[PDB]
Design an enzyme around this catalytic site. Structure first.
Site, PDB file in Angstrom:
ATOM      1  N   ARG A  57       0.943  -1.000   0.044  1.00 34.04           N
ATOM      2  CA  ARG A  57      -0.097  -0.241  -0.085  1.00 34.04           C
ATOM      3  C   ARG A  57       1.326   1.072  -0.194  1.00 34.04           C
ATOM      4  O   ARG A  57       1.430   1.201   0.942  1.00 34.04           O
ATOM      5  CB  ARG A  57      -0.993   0.101   1.010  1.00 34.04           C
ATOM      6  CG  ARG A  57      -2.117   1.027   1.333  1.00 34.04           C
ATOM      7  CD  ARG A  57      -3.103   0.322   2.028  1.00 34.04           C
ATOM      8  NE  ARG A  57      -4.499   1.482   1.852  1.00 34.04           N
ATOM      9  CZ  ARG A  57      -4.348   2.629   3.160  1.00 34.04           C
ATOM     10  NH1 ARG A  57      -2.881   2.980   3.841  1.00 34.04           N
ATOM     11  NH2 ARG A  57      -4.850   2.917   3.344  1.00 34.04           N
ATOM     12  N   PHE A  62       1.565  10.231   2.843  1.00 36.82           N
ATOM     13  CA  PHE A  62       1.315  10.335   3.681  1.00 36.82           C
ATOM     14  C   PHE A  62       1.820   8.982   4.202  1.00 36.82           C
ATOM     15  O   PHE A  62       3.030   9.225   5.258  1.00 36.82           O
ATOM     16  CB  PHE A  62      -0.037   9.810   3.464  1.00 36.82           C
ATOM     17  CG  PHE A  62      -0.709   8.621   4.222  1.00 36.82           C
ATOM     18  CD1 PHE A  62      -0.450   8.960   6.586  1.00 36.82           C
ATOM     19  CD2 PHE A  62      -2.350   8.230   4.399  1.00 36.82           C
ATOM     20  CE1 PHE A  62      -0.820   8.564   6.814  1.00 36.82           C
ATOM     21  CE2 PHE A  62      -2.700   7.430   5.652  1.00 36.82           C
ATOM     22  CZ  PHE A  62      -1.949   7.705   7.454  1.00 36.82           C
ATOM     23  N   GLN A  65       3.458   1.412   3.234  1.00 41.48           N
ATOM     24  CA  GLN A  65       3.058   0.187   3.909  1.00 41.48           C
ATOM     25  C   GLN A  65       3.647  -1.447   3.070  1.00 41.48           C
ATOM     26  O   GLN A  65       3.561  -1.743   2.079  1.00 41.48           O
ATOM     27  CB  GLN A  65       1.897   0.587   4.812  1.00 41.48           C
ATOM     28  CG  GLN A  65       1.196  -0.330   5.442  1.00 41.48           C
ATOM     29  CD  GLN A  65      -0.296  -0.864   6.101  1.00 41.48           C
ATOM     30  OE1 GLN A  65      -0.878  -0.104   5.063  1.00 41.48           O
ATOM     31  NE2 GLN A  65      -0.740  -1.781   6.353  1.00 41.48           N
ATOM     32  N   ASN A 103      -1.942  -1.897  12.708  1.00 40.93           N
ATOM     33  CA  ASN A 103      -2.405  -2.310  13.659  1.00 40.93           C
ATOM     34  C   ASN A 103      -3.933  -2.348  13.596  1.00 40.93           C
ATOM     35  O   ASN A 103      -4.639  -1.672  12.663  1.00 40.93           O
ATOM     36  CB  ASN A 103      -1.575  -2.306  15.257  1.00 40.93           C
ATOM     37  CG  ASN A 103      -2.470  -0.606  15.329  1.00 40.93           C
ATOM     38  OD1 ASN A 103      -4.254   0.011  15.216  1.00 40.93           O
ATOM     39  ND2 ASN A 103      -2.264  -0.033  16.234  1.00 40.93           N
ATOM     40  N   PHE A 114       5.162   0.825   8.679  1.00 40.41           N
ATOM     41  CA  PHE A 114       5.327   1.623   7.591  1.00 40.41           C
ATOM     42  C   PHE A 114       5.707   3.104   7.598  1.00 40.41           C
ATOM     43  O   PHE A 114       6.543   2.842   8.571  1.00 40.41           O
ATOM     44  CB  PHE A 114       3.332   2.013   7.286  1.00 40.41           C
ATOM     45  CG  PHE A 114       2.873   2.362   8.818  1.00 40.41           C
ATOM     46  CD1 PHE A 114       2.078   1.791   9.073  1.00 40.41           C
ATOM     47  CD2 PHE A 114       3.263   4.002   8.368  1.00 40.41           C
ATOM     48  CE1 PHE A 114       1.795   2.702  10.751  1.00 40.41           C
ATOM     49  CE2 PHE A 114       2.549   4.894  10.117  1.00 40.41           C
ATOM     50  CZ  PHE A 114       1.549   4.367  10.971  1.00 40.41           C
ATOM     51  N   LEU A 123      -2.177  10.186  13.727  1.00 41.05           N
ATOM     52  CA  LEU A 123      -1.961   8.500  14.138  1.00 41.05           C
ATOM     53  C   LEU A 123      -1.311   8.336  15.454  1.00 41.05           C
ATOM     54  O   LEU A 123      -1.295   7.411  15.389  1.00 41.05           O
ATOM     55  CB  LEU A 123      -1.016   7.744  12.789  1.00 41.05           C
ATOM     56  CG  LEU A 123      -1.602   7.785  11.868  1.00 41.05           C
ATOM     57  CD1 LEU A 123      -0.368   7.490  10.701  1.00 41.05           C
ATOM     58  CD2 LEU A 123      -2.647   6.595  11.340  1.00 41.05           C
ATOM     59  N   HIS A 127      -0.024   3.921  16.984  1.00 36.78           N
ATOM     60  CA  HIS A 127       0.768   3.206  16.466  1.00 36.78           C
ATOM     61  C   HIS A 127       2.238   3.603  17.502  1.00 36.78           C
ATOM     62  O   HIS A 127       2.797   4.657  17.033  1.00 36.78           O
ATOM     63  CB  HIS A 127       0.910   3.605  14.953  1.00 36.78           C
ATOM     64  CG  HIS A 127      -0.607   3.539  14.237  1.00 36.78           C
ATOM     65  ND1 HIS A 127      -1.328   2.499  14.008  1.00 36.78           N
ATOM     66  CD2 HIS A 127      -1.665   4.347  14.257  1.00 36.78           C
ATOM     67  CE1 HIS A 127      -1.426   1.709  13.362  1.00 36.78           C
ATOM     68  NE2 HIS A 127      -2.404   3.289  13.859  1.00 36.78           N
TER      69      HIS A 127
END
Length: 166
Positions: A57, A62, A65, A103, A114, A123, A127
């Protein structure tokens, strides 16, 4: 930022095109369990790991991942401790070049992670940030511009052809 206690790397290729090496520094003192899991998945000490997995991904401005070496689509992965382990430190905020655990809620850390390519305050606190890109950020930025599609998955596999400890 926290102290780097170990270094791991990823050699990345995109269909015959070698992009280079990404070097990641791990915050061993602030997240021992999380770093050890990442470290051993890099070396492949247990028979499974990041070698030959992909960054499934990619979302420009941003993050990128990877880590799902079982299903290659974002639904798999597993830690060295088993299915999932607890969140160690949620007080470290994200920053450009941070390596963070993906997660599916609290205490569901597996192998997916990521690398952020921009501020990601939304985030923070949810995380575990366990390290940062010490070298090869240009490689991360190159991966970020790769052509994707609906679901943000690279049209051409972005493959980790090698991983280990430096």
């Amino acid at each position: 930022e926290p102290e780097v206690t170990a270094k791991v790397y990823f050699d990345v290729m995109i269909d015959s095109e070698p992009l280079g090496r990404i070097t990641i520094g791990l915050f061993g003192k602030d997240a021992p369990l999380t770093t050890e899991n990442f470290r051993q998945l890099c070396t492949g000490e247990h028979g499974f790991g990041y070698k030959d997995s992909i960054f499934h991904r990619v979302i420009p401005n941003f993050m990128i991942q990877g880590g799902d070496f079982t299903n290659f689509d974002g639904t798999g992965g597993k830690s060295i401790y088993g299915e999932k382990f607890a969140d160690e430190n949620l007080k470290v905020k994200h920053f450009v070049g941070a390596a963070s655990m993906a997660n599916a809620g609290p205490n569901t850390n597996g192998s997916q992670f990521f690398i952020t390519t921009a501020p990601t305050p939304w985030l923070d606190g949810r995380h575990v940030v366990f390290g940062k890109v010490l070298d090869g950020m240009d490689v991360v930025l190159r991966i970020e511009k790769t052509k994707t599609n609906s679901h943000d998955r690279p049209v051409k596999p972005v493959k980790i052809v090698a991983s280990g400890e430096l």
